[PDB]
Design a protein around this nucleic acid. Sequence first.
RNA 1: GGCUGUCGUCAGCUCGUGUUGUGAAAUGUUGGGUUAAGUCCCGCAACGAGCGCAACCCUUAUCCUUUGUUGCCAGCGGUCC
Length: 113
Amino acid sequence: MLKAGVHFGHQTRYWNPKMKPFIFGARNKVHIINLEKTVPMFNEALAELNKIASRKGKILFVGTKRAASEAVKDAALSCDQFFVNHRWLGGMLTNWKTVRQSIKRLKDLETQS
RNA sequence: GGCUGUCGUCAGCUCGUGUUGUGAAAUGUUGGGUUAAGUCCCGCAACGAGCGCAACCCUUAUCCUUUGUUGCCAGCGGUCC
Ligand SMILES: [Mg+2]
Ligand SMILES: [Mg+2]
């Protein structure tokens, strides 16, 4: 099952009871995730993800925090998928129809940079 | 009506969209700095915009080009200086 070498799942008491099923944990006053449930989760996850992908679908990666920021400007910045590695501008998706023309500007700047 | 004084040349006053709240409303315009300034930077469920601040206007301080009378006299002669 564990095709995933090393990511035992941090965070100690600061937990969330909604996250009981996916837990086997209890070590050194901190939770351990679950082998036999992390792996099964690709099941519904990589299945649908690589299907909508086949149907030609935009992806968009999201990962703020300067601890994996350019680590998403990566093989996510390789395919027809996209990314957000910094500040998530509130409403860039629900208010897309406004934020869109902040892009139109970016374009005008790099189109003369 | 038009025009004017006043707070005050104070740094303020608002809207679109989005989002939050049953709602009046909120956010943006909190906050950390910074500035003469809602000035700017960072931040941030906000993203942007309008009036305002600033700039564009005039004048003042240095220089340059063009211009030389009614303005000017440095080097030239003459002197009723
Ligand atoms: Mg302004
Ligand atoms: Mg002005």
